[PDB]
Structures are given as structure tokens and as C-alpha cells.
Amino acid sequence: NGKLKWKFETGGSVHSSPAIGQDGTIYVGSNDHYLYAINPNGKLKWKFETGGSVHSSPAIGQDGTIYVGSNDHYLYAINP
Amino acid sequence: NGKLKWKFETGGSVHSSPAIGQDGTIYVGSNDHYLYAINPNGKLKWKFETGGSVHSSPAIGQDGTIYVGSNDHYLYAINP
Amino acid sequence: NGKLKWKFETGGSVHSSPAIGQDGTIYVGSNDHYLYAINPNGKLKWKFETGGSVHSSPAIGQDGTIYVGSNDHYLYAINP
Amino acid sequence: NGKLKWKFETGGSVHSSPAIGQDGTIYVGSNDHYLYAINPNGKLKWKFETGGSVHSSPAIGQDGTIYVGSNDHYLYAINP
Ligand SMILES: [Zn+2]
Ligand SMILES: [Zn+2]
Ligand SMILES: [Zn+2]
Ligand SMILES: [Zn+2]
Ligand SMILES: [Zn+2]
Ligand SMILES: [Zn+2]
Ligand SMILES: [Zn+2]
Ligand SMILES: [Zn+2]
Numbered sequence: 001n002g003k004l005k006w007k008f009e010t011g012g013s014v015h016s017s018p019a020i021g022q023d024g025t026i027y028v029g030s031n032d033h034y035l036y037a038i039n040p041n042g043k044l045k046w047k048f049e050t051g052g053s054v055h056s057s058p059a060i061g062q063d064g065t066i067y068v069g070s071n072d073h074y075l076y077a078i079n080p
Numbered sequence: 081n082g083k084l085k086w087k088f089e090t091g092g093s094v095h096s097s098p099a100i101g102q103d104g105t106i107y108v109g110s111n112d113h114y115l116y117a118i119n120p121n122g123k124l125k126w127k128f129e130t131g132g133s134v135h136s137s138p139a140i141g142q143d144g145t146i147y148v149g150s151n152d153h154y155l156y157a158i159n160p
Numbered sequence: 161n162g163k164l165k166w167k168f169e170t171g172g173s174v175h176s177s178p179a180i181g182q183d184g185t186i187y188v189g190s191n192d193h194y195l196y197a198i199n200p201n202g203k204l205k206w207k208f209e210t211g212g213s214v215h216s217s218p219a220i221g222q223d224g225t226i227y228v229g230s231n232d233h234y235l236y237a238i239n240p
Numbered sequence: 241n242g243k244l245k246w247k248f249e250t251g252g253s254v255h256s257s258p259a260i261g262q263d264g265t266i267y268v269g270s271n272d273h274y275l276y277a278i279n280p281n282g283k284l285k286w287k288f289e290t291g292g293s294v295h296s297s298p299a300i301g302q303d304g305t306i307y308v309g310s311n312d313h314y315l316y317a318i319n320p
Contacts, residue, residue: 002126014149046242069254082206094229162286174309
């Protein structure tokens, strides 16, 4: 209905587009260099530090693996 | 067939890529800082103001929740 | 196997990410301001001129409608 | 669980967002001008050189064809 459910603060601009896991987990990169995994309730699940801004948008594999590029030149594969 | 169905004017460049809800609603960010929810007929459903340009492309959860990053550093979860 | 099938020349950088229709049609924006509809064989189906660069990536609705933002501030809904 | 599975080094910033094939292959562009095809185990499958940075995010057709734009103005269709 367009009402805020919650907002989660990262350390930089969130240019990355979120991806949704099988359990509802939301994955998204931030310009603060981290890939974020956020629970559907808004609490952080984990965050993974890459070497540069994560402008790339994550994709989820058939086994749950999360893949995302970084401006540090790497394609990352992160376990769930 | 490549003919215009309609066009909806936001207040800034629409860099964000649209997402489609279960009922056909189209969600998209604008550089004018808003997340837009547009009905399949072209009429605005609602718009949600974040603190910065919405370059991020929205994702839709299993329960309809719309998630999108903003250049204000936040990942937003918006109720339908 | 990583061999070129074909390449289709637009008038500018293709920053937009392609979307695939029910019949295999590939839709993508170009910085030349057009939304392109390309047949799976590489021949143009149609192209639609917006008012600015199409950095936004198209989405396809349940009825085939293609939606894409433009840097001209508009969200476009294009008939198939 | 947020632990690194692997990271694959390209020659430039990975702004492109990855796409996942039917067999788990991960496709992604790099600013080094290549489209990469990476096996789920982290070993390169192939890489395809376009004429400019691949900021566009790949899409996969019903027959496995991978489509991606390049800043060289072209939309590419690459065989699997
Ligand atoms: Zn900032
Ligand atoms: Zn930095
Ligand atoms: Zn403008
Ligand atoms: Zn602003
Ligand atoms: Zn050029
Ligand atoms: Zn222009
Ligand atoms: Zn670099
Ligand atoms: Zn270059």
C-alpha cells in the first residue's frame, strides 16, 4: 500500500539492485564495498566485504549461492 | 507491436529498471528520489519518497514486499 | 560454447540490460534513445524512440507489455 | 552463511550483474570488454571479447543463448 515497512542503513549509496533468496533473504551491494544479506524483518543476517564498490546486482544460483561483481575486478561467489 | 501504450512522467531520469508485481503493478525508481508504483493502465498507485536518487532497481518478495536501494545509503522495504 | 551467434548495431552504448519475451524476442535500450525489439535471429523487429538515453533495463508484463524508463524522465509502456 | 566460496578475477570493474544458466553457469560482463562464462566451481568456461566495456547485464534465452549489450554500441547474442 506504499507504507514503509523498514529501511536498513548501509555505509554508502545502494546502487546495486536487490535479489531475493528462497527464504526471503534480501541480498544487495553497497558502494561501501559490502554485499549485504538482510532478513525479511530488517535485521542484518551477514555482510561480506569486497575490495571495492558493489555496483553489480547479485544473482542466486540453484543451490543458493549468491554471485555479485565488485569494482575490485572480481566476480564473487558467496555461500548463503 | 511497438506502439506506445502510455508514458508516465516522473520528476527526473528513470535510470532504475522496472519490476512487475503479481497484479501487474509496475514499480520503478526515479532520480527524483521516489519509488513509483504504477497501475497497468498508467495511473499512479502511490509514490514513496526516499532521501536520494533511486538508481537501484526494485525486487519483489514472495509476500509482495518491494525492496529497493537509494543513494541515501538505505535499502528500503515498502509494503505493496 | 562461447561462439558469436550474431551482433546487432545500435546507435550508441548499450548500457541497458536485455529482457526476453515469451517468443524469444530480445528487448533492450540504447544510449541512442531507442528501445529495441530484436528477433532471435538478429533481425530488427521494431525500435521505439524515447526522448533520452534508455539506461533502464526493460521488464515484461504478464500480457507482454514492455516497460522501460528513459532519461527523458518517463516510464514507458510499449505494446509488444 | 556469508563465507566466501570463491572469487574470479577479471581485468576490470565488474559493473555488470550476473545471470545464471540452466546448468549453473554464471555469465557476467566486465569493464575489461569481455563477457565471462564461469563454472559453478570457479573455473573459467570461456570469455568473449566485445569492442567496449560490458556494463550491460546478460540475459539468457529459452534455448540457452546469452544476450548482452556492450559500450561498443552492439547487442551481442553468444552461443552457450
Ligand atoms: Zn552518500
Ligand atoms: Zn570505495
Ligand atoms: Zn532531466
Ligand atoms: Zn537529488
Ligand atoms: Zn560510442
Ligand atoms: Zn542523447
Ligand atoms: Zn580498477
Ligand atoms: Zn575500455
